[PDB]
Paper text:
Those [name] identified in the orthosteric site of either [name] or [name] recapitulate a key interaction made by the endogenous and known synthetic bromodomain ligands with a conserved asparagine residue (Asn1064 in [name], Asn140 in [name]).
[name] was proposed from computational druggability analysis to be less tractable than [name], attributed in part to it lacking the hydrophobic region present in the [name] ligand binding site, termed the “WPF shelf”, interactions with which are postulated to contribute significantly to ligand binding affinity.
Author numbering: 40 to 168
The structure:
């Protein structure tokens, strides 16, 4: 895309060891599936296009970008070794939103609704088997 947006996060790397675990399967089949289809998912389904949104400071502030489209691809590509890596990606996505935006803001309200759902689902994450 625009040279003024950063390259998106890595979703493929043959040198990175990978595994499928039951926890990772749950994160794709239950957690991501639930959040992806939520009414408020759309701002989080792809990287922030700071040029199109006219937010030239976005990637000055947010140095650790993450989005659900990247997480979806990481899960589909079996990019992760364990569930914590994936959970950390979701946490980074929510924290980016809270850092950049204000407590009033529509996108924050949306992120908070998604994060509540995420927490509920992670509380039921199965033991690794
Ligand atoms: C309002 O700024 C934004 C912040 C994040 Br994080 C995602 C989308 C946005 O529009």
């Amino acid at each position: 895309g625009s040279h003024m947006n950063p390259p998106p996060p890595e979703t493929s790397n043959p040198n990175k060891p990978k595994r499928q675990t039951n926890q990772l399967q749950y994160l794709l089949r239950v957690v991501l599936k639930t959040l992806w289809k939520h009414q408020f998912a759309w701002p989080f389904q792809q990287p922030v296009d700071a040029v199109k949104l006219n937010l030239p400071d976005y990637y000055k502030i947010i140095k650790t970008p993450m989005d659900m489209g990247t997480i979806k691809k990481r899960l589909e590509n079996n990019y992760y070794w364990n569930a914590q890596e994936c959970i950390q990606d979701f946490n980074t996505m929510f924290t980016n939103c809270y850092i950049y935006n204000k407590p009033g803001d529509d996108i924050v309200l949306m992120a908070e609704a998604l994060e509540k759902l995420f927490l509920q689902k992670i509380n039921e994450l199965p033991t690794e088997e």
